[PDB]
């Protein structure tokens, strides 16, 4: 359900940080919510 190279991983703090595995970019916000 994600864009190519996008991750939804939950850090040990219990938060899902969405990684862009293409351009090495990271964001807490979700492209799916848009």
């Amino acid at each position: 359900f994600l864009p190519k190279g996008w991750e939804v991983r939950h850090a040990p703090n219990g938060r899902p940080f969405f990684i862009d595995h293409n351009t090495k970019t990271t964001t807490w916000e979700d492209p799916r919510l848009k």
Binding site: E7, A11, F17, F18, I19, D20, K24, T26, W28
Partner: peptide, 9 residues
């Protein structure tokens, strides 16, 4: 607030 990158492709 910085989110950790990816290690695994």
């Amino acid at each position: 607030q910085i989110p950790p990158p990816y290690v695994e492709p």
